[PDB]
Amino acid sequence: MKLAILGAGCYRTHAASGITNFSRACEVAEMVGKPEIAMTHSTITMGAELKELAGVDEVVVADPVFDNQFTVIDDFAYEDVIEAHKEDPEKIMPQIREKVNEVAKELPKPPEGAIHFTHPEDLGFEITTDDREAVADADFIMTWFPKGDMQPDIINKFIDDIKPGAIVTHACTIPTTKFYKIFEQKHGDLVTKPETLNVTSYHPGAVPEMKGQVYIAEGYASEDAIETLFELGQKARGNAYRLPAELLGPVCDMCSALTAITYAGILSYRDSVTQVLGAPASFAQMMAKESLEQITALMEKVGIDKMEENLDPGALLGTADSMNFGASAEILPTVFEILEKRKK
Amino acid sequence: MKLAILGAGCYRTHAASGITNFSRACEVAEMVGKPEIAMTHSTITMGAELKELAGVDEVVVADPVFDNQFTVIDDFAYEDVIEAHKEDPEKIMPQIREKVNEVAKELPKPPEGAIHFTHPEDLGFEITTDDREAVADADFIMTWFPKGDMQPDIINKFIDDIKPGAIVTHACTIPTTKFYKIFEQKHGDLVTKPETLNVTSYHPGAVPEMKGQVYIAEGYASEDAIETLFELGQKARGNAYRLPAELLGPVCDMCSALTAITYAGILSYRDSVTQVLGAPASFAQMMAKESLEQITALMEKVGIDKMEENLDPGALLGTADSMNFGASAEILPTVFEILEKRKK
């Protein structure tokens, strides 16, 4: 199956963040004993995984940057990086970052400049400048395009070259429904039938070189297409998650912390109800619905910053404490610590 | 002013639950040196507070139960109760539950049979059997009616006797909107003028005799009417919380645990965003809304019992960890242990 990767990505914002490392990239590099996989990033990391771990032998990378200022930082040896990542990545990341921040200071933004440490070339990938030729006959198209208004412009350039049935993916720079509407703009043509395309995500939920995980949005691709990506992703990335398109941002964006907290609440609360009060799940659901809609409606009504003025966080200490049993007892005591600090 | 207490309560369901005690009732007994207050429950405990701590000079309790099987269990001297509660309430509570449970297996439900340990008469309370008489010129009507479709029937008897602008309250046996709608049914009358009534709540959020707290629903009363009820509750119950009626159930009922967990989540999450990222509150609220709504939409779509089949609880571990800072650091590590356990 031919994989066309569209967008090689740039490292600058990984370095500038100050909190990324190469720990996944190092893990695969060792699995397959190819040290140069160790400092791959973004789409190049995920491409090595697909080729080396998931039997995907035909990989093309396309990016206009290859014919511009594609810069390869050779200052650091693969081996020292692998070595450092066994005990503490921080023995080496500070200087990797400084070196990149310095190169990035003067270097144009991607599609004109991009910063890597290992050429995709060196991993047996076809490299090209022409998106149209990359996608010709491609069964899996991985897009990795910049945020905002350029994505439809990038995409309409090659859309009619995408073979019917293809799997076409996006990552963190666009929401799925926005990505989908681009292909939708082209429904009606009978020569291409983009209506047959399987649109979804291959979202790392983090810089891929740091973490083995991928997030696959459901709602637009076929069952078969997402089962296919999920197997491929499990294998290549180590950890795959198949979830509805409408939870992609809630799970992957910086609201993830609130999503995690409240999903934990829900599961804990549900269990303490079913398992210790013997109720059917619908009883727990009904209560949970009202509780979630009402706290949410309060936040919308007065402002997130003004909730305490309207509902004294201490109001909950005298009622919820008698629910402090079963699964809920895992979370409730920490919650009590927070509300007690915060009361009027 | 005049407080009309409508319903004396029965102890049987407090005993039957096996988790209540008299620890508030005891507290106020010692604050005013009347040991007989130690073994009040329900509406009688709260009436002692408003008379003896808030300076409510005049109290009527109405209940058809007084002309029937109003049984005062005299077995236990207030003194062993008071003493027991100073150290450990469980040294005595079990035999009290035993005695109540016994004499309650055979005794008619309330309005026909009711169990108490101190007669309202001994507290210098006016006792009556006629609601209409109890409410004449009463400024604060505290209702304490059974759950179900008798509440309208009960209220439709004295509705035309309630003086204009009166405070009218409810507790755990009816939601405020449902309470309101009963008075609604008379909103045409020029003589009654029920349009002028200040409908709210005086909800304990637990058995009154165990905890000093009250919960006051906003939305139907005037601002001054809720203000003055708040002052009274403050002094009478020890802790008062005034909140929107839409939140009464989410806060006081079985779902309290979830409302607590998620409210904690919201506050920590917001704080970490404004104080650490330096973004306006509106940014956090925008994120929080999508997160709350989507996780709730999911529960509703697949069933609270099937969520994990659709969104792997481990999906949140590789994304939410990057939000582990500021106030969210107080709660996220606990959340991580819960998700970790439940992951597919």
UniProtKB/Swiss-Prot annotation, chains A, B:
pH dependency: Optimum pH is 6.0-6.5 when making H(2) and 7.5 in the other direction.
What EC identifiers does the entry list? 1.12.98.2
Q: Which UniProt keywords apply?
A: Methanogenesis, One-carbon metabolism, Oxidoreductase
**What is the uppermost EC class here?**
oxidoreductase
Looking at the record's lineage, which domain of life comes first? Archaea
Return the Pfam families for the record: HMD, HMD_N
Report the record's Gene Ontology biological process terms: methanogenesis, from carbon dioxide; one-carbon metabolic process
Cited InterPro entries = 6-PGluconate_DH-like_C_sf (IPR008927), HMD (IPR010062), HMD_C (IPR004889), HMD_C_sf (IPR038182), HMD_N (IPR055205), METHMP_Hmd (IPR024190), NAD(P)-bd_dom_sf (IPR036291)
Q: Name one GO molecular function term.
A: N5,N10-methenyltetrahydromethanopterin hydrogenase activity
> HAMAP family annotated for this entry?
HMD
Name of this protein: 5,10-methenyltetrahydromethanopterin hydrogenase
